[PDB]
Amino acid sequence: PKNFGLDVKITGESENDRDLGTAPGGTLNDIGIDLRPWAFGQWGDWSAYFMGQAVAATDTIETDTLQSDKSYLAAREFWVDYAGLTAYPGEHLRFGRQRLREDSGQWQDTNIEALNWSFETTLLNAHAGVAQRFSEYRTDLDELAPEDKDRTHVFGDISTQWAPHHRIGVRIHHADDSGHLRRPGEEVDNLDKTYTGQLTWLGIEATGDAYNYRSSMPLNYWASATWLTGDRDNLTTTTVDDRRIATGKQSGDVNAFGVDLGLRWNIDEQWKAGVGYARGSGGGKDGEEQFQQTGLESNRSNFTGTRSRVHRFGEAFRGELSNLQAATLFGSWQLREDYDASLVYHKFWRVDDDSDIGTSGINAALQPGEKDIGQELDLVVTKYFSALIRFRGGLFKPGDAYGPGTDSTMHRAFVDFIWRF
Ligand SMILES: CCCCCCC/C=C\CCCCCC(=O)OC[C@@H](O)CO
Ligand SMILES: CCCCCCCCCCCC[N+](C)(C)[O-]
Ligand SMILES: CCCCCCCCCCCC[N+](C)(C)[O-]
Ligand SMILES: CCCCCCCCCCCC[N+](C)(C)[O-]
Ligand SMILES: CCCCCCCCCCCC[N+](C)(C)[O-]
Ligand SMILES: [Ca+2]
Ligand code: NA
Ligand code: NA
Closest residue (by CA) to atom 2 of ligand 5? 52
Q: What is the dihedral of CA 93, 97, 101, 105, to 10 degrees?
A: 160
Residues in Cβ contact with 86 at an 8 Å cutoff, skipping those fewer than 6 apart = 119
The answer to whether the beta carbons of residues 30 and 14 sit under 8 Å apart is no
The angstrom resolution of this structure is: 2.8
Query: Among 77, 113, 138, which residue has the most ligand 5 atoms within 8 Å of its CB, making it the best to mutate?
Result: 138
Closest residue (by CA) to atom 3 of ligand 4? 415
Query: Distance between CA atoms of 27 and 46, rounded to whole angstroms?
Result: 47
- Of all ligands present, the nearest one to the C-alpha of 272 is 8
Q: Which residues line ligand 5 (CB under 6 A)?
A: 52, 73-75, 135, 137, 139, 142
339 CA distance to ligand 8 centroid (A)?
Answer: 15
- The SS3 assignment for 405 reads coil
Ramachandran region, residue 218 (left: φ > 0; alpha: ψ -120 to 50; beta: rest): alpha
Query: Distance between CA atoms of 373 and 279, rounded to whole angstroms?
Result: 14
Closest residue (by CA) to atom 11 of ligand 4? 30
Kindly calculate the radius of gyration of the chain based on its CA atoms and give it in whole angstroms.
Answer: 22
Torsions phi, psi of 291, nearest 5? -85, 160
Torsions phi, psi of 66, nearest 5? -65, 165
Closest residue (by CA) to atom 12 of ligand 3? 14
> Of the candidates 279, 226, 224, 291, which has an alpha carbon nearest to the alpha carbon of residue 254?
291
Domains identified in the chain and CATH numbers: 1-421 (2.40.160.100)
Residue type, 49: Y
Ligand 4 pocket member 393 (CB < 6 A): no
Ligand 4 pocket member 58 (CB < 6 A): yes
DSSP E strand stretches across 293-338? 300-301, 310-311, 319-320, 324-335
